[PDB]
Amino acid sequence: GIGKFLKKAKKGIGAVLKVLTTGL
Known part of the structure; x- marks a missing residue:
């Protein structure tokens, strides 16, 4: 999760x- x-x-x-924007 965000923990990473x-x-x-x-x-x-x-x-x-x-990459977080590709799943957000």
């Missing part, structure tokens, strides 16, 4: 937020 988006947001966030 906030946890991964540390550095490589542009990747999570990028």
